[PDB]
Design a protein around this ligand. Structure first.
Ligand SMILES: C[C@@]1(O)[C@H](O)[C@@H](CO)O[C@H]1n1ccc2c(N)ncnc21
Ligand SMILES: C[C@@]1(O)[C@H](O)[C@@H](CO)O[C@H]1n1ccc2c(N)ncnc21
Lengths: 382, 382
C-alpha cells in the first residue's frame, strides 16, 4: 500500500510539495511558513545539516560549504560539456568520482565528505517528505516527482534514485510542463489543443509546446535558456545597489560576504513587492562597517535594470513555434509557470507576443507544477 | 460515515447524477445509456412501475397513468393558485389530500393509488440512486440535491423529504444556478463578480443574477418563464408537420395518439441534430393509416417556427438586470444551462444581447448543474 502519495516539484532553485486531501489539492507550507522551499543544503561548524530556508539564509563567510543547483549536475557524467561549464560558476568543489560530478564539502570540524548529485537532491526530497509528514501527521513512503521535459534517461533515473535515498518510492516521473497543464485542468478539454508553457524559474527558463488530444499530452518541442531566472533579476539589482553604495560612500560592499547576503535577502523581498507596487524600500541596520543601508527601488528602475533579460525570453518562444510548425494564433492555451511570471513586465511581454491573448489563471505559478503532481498523487492514493 | 456522496440535479423534465471519482467529476449514464434521465414515472397494465426513459417512451396505454412535472407541485398546497393553474394542463388526476396536491393513478388492473408530489420525486431519485450504485458497484446513502433559486422553505423541505423516501440523506440543498457556477469553477475567482445564469430547461426558463465575493454566493434576483422550454420548441415543430400532413393527405394526425407520440420522439431527435447540422430527416414507418412519414426540416425553418419563443428569453434577462440595478457591461460571467442553450440561434441571441461577450464553455449545459452538485459532493465524501 502507498498510503498518501505526495506530489513533489524538485526545482533547480526551489521545491514545492502537494497532497490530495478531502477532495482537493493542498500545497504544504514548510516549518518557516513557506509554500516553496529552497533546493539548498549547508553544514554548520558543529556539523548540523541545514536544508531549505535555513541553508539559503545561514549567514556565512564560507560559500564553498553550501550546496545548490544540484539539478544542473544530476544524471550527468563529470566530463559532460554542460557540467564542465557549470562548475566554473559554482562556489563549492566538484570532483570526478565513479564517472560522475560529485560535490565535495566540509561537513563540520574539517571532515570532508563527497556526495553524488542525487545524494544532494535526496536531502532536498527528505526535507519535502518531512514537510508533508508534519502536515499529514503520518509517514510518507510514495511520491510523484516532476522533471524538465528535456530530461534524458540518466537524468530521470538519477531523480528516481534521489527519491530512493530519501526513503521515497517515486511511482511516477512526470514532465514539469505537463504537470502545470494538468494543474490548470487542461486535460479535461475536448478536441486537439496546442499549449504553450512559459516557465521562468529561479535559475532556468523553459519553454515547452505541448499538444492535448482526447485527454493525452505530447511534448512537441522545447527551448529556453538554461541560465536565466529570477535570481538573475536579483543580481542585476544587487549590482545596482553595490555600485550606488561605492559612489555614495567609497566602500566596496563585496569585501564582506555577510553584507552581500543581507542585501541579497532584502533585494529578493523588494523584487517580489515590485510585482504589486511601484516602489520598494530596502533597509539593513549595521550593513557595512557599522553604517546602515536605506535605499528605494522603483518598478521603472527594476524594469530598466532587467529589460534585456525580460525581452530575451521571447526568442525561445519564437523558436519553439517554428520547431512545432505553428504560428502565434495556433496557441490555444498559455500556461505561466514560476514566481517570476508574476513580474508585470513579463506578463505584458508574453500577452503582447500573443496579440493580447490572456494566459490561463487561478493557480499560483510557483505551485502549478507541484499542484499537477499532487493531482496525479491523489489518483494513486485512491 | 457518508460514503461516496452523489450530486443530483432533480429537474422538472430531466434529471442528472454525478460523482467525484479518481480526481474528477463523472456524469453517470443510466441503464439505457443516457447521461440524463426523464423525471417520469409510468405504470404498465400488468402493474410494472416504469421510471425515466421507459416511462417517457412507453407507447401510451397511460396518458392519465404517466406522471411527470411533479416539480411544479412539490412543496405546494392544493389551493396554491400556481397548482390550480398547472393541474388544468396535466393529464393525470390531482386530488386534495392532507392540504396537498396528491397524484392519483391506476397502478394496474384498476387499482387506484394516491402519491404525494415528493413520493413521485422520490421514485425519480431512487432511479438516480440506482444509476449511481450500478456505476460505483456499492450502495449510496448521501446526496447533494439542487433546487431552483426561487424555491421557498416548503419546496426545499419537500425535496429533502423526497430524498428521505428514496433512502438518501440529502446533506445539502444547493441552488441550481449556484451549482452551474461551481461547475465552471467561478467560486475560485478573486474579488466581486456578477454572474448571469441563463437556464433554458426542457419545461422551464430561469434567469438568475448571482454575485460571488471571496468564495460566497448570493442570489440577487431571479426571473424567467415557468412554462417555456425545449418541449415548447418540439411542439412548434409538431404543429408544423401535423398541418403539413393535413395539407398533403387530408388526414388529421391527432386522431391517433400513438402516431403523435412517434412523431414527438422523432421531432425531439431531429431538433437536437439541428443544433450541429443544417438539415434533419424524420422517418416513421406505418405512421398513419398504414402510410409512412418521410419529411425534412431545415435549421432556418426550425428557427422561423420558434423565433418569437427564442426572442422572448431576452425580456426576463433585461428584468433581472433592472431588479439587480445592473447594466449589460456589469456582467462578468454568462453561464448557459440546459440542452436547449445548444441551439445556435439561442447562443447568438444571448451573445448579441451582451454586445458580443462569450459565455462560459466546456461543460455540457444539460449536465452542468449535476456537475456542480458532484464537485460539492466530492468535498463531502473526503
Ligand atoms: C522566489 C523568487 O524570487 C525566485 O526567483 C523564483 C522561484 O520560482 O520566483 C521568484 N518569485 C516568487 C514570487 C515572485 C513575485 N511576486 N515577483 C517576482 N518574483 C517572484
Ligand atoms: C433533451 C432536450 O430536447 C430537452 O428539451 C432539454 C432538456 O434540458 O434539452 C434538450 N436538448 C438536449 C440536447 C440538445 C441539443 N443538442 N439541441 C437542442 N436541444 C437539446
Amino acid at each position: 500500500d502507498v498510503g498518501t502519495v505526495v506530489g513533489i516539484d524538485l526545482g533547480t532553485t526551489y521545491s514545492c510539495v502537494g497532497v490530495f486531501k478531502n477532495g482537493r489539492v493542498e500545497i504544504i507550507a514548510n516549518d518557516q511558513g513557506n509554500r516553496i522551499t529552497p533546493s539548498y543544503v549547508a553544514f554548520t561548524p558543529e556539523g548540523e545539516r541545514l536544508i531549505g530556508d535555513a541553508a539559503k539564509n545561514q549567514l556565512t563567510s564560507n560559500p564553498e560549504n553550501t550546496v545548490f543547483d544540484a539539478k544542473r549536475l544530476i544524471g550527468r557524467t563529470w566530463n559532460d560539456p554542460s557540467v564542465q561549464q557549470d562548475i566554473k560558476f559554482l562556489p563549492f568543489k566538484v570532483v570526478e568520482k565513479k564517472t560522475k560530478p560529485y560535490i565535495q564539502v566540509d561537513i563540520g570540524g574539517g571532515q570532508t565528505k563527497t556526495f553524488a548529485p542525487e545524494e544532494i537532491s535526496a536531502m532536498v526530497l527528505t526535507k519535502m517528505k518531512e514537510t508533508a509528514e508534519a502536515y499529514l501527521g503520518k509517514k510518507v513512503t510514495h511520491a510523484v516527482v516532476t522533471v524538465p521535459a528535456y530530461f534524458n534517461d540518466a537524468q530521470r533515473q538519477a531523480t528516481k534514485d534521489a527519491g530512493t535515498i530519501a526513503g521515497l518510492n517515486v511511482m511516477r516521473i512526470i514532465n514539469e510542463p505537463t504537470a502545470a497543464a494538468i494543474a490548470y485542468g487542461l486535460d479535461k478539454r475536448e478536441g486537439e489543443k496546442n499549449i504553450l508553457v512559459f516557465d521562468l524559474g529561479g535559475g532556468t527558463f523553459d519553454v515547452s509546446l505541448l499538444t492535448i488530444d482526447n485527454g493525452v499530452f505530447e511534448v512537441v518541442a522545447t527551448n529556453g535558456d538554461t541560465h536565466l531566472g529570477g535570481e538573475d533579476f536579483d543580481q542585476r539589482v544587487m549590482e545596482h545597489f553595490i555600485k550606488l553604495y561605492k559612489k555614495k560612500t567609497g566602500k566596496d560592499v563585496r569585501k564582506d560576504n555577510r553584507a552581500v547576503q543581507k542585501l541579497r535577502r532584502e533585494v529578493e523581498k523588494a523584487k517580489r513587492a515590485l510585482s504589486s507596487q511601484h516602489q520598494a524600500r530596502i533597509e539593513i541596520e549595521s550593513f557595512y562597517e557599522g553604517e546602515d543601508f536605506s535605499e528605494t527601488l522603483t518598478r521603472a528602475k527594476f524594469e530598466e535594470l532587467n529589460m534585456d533579460l525580460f525581452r530575451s525570453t521571447m526568442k525561445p518562444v519564437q523558436k519553439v513555434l517554428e520547431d512545432s510548425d505553428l504560428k502565434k494564433s495556433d496557441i490555444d492555451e498559455i500556461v505561466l509557470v514560476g514566481g517570476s511570471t508574476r513580474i508585470p513586465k513579463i506578463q505584458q511581454l508574453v500577452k503582447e507576443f500573443f496579440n493580447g491573448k490572456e494566459p490561463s489563471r487561478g493557480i499560483n505559478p510557483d505551485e502549478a507544477v507541484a499542484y499537477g503532481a499532487a493531482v496525479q498523487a491523489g489518483v494513486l492514493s485512491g
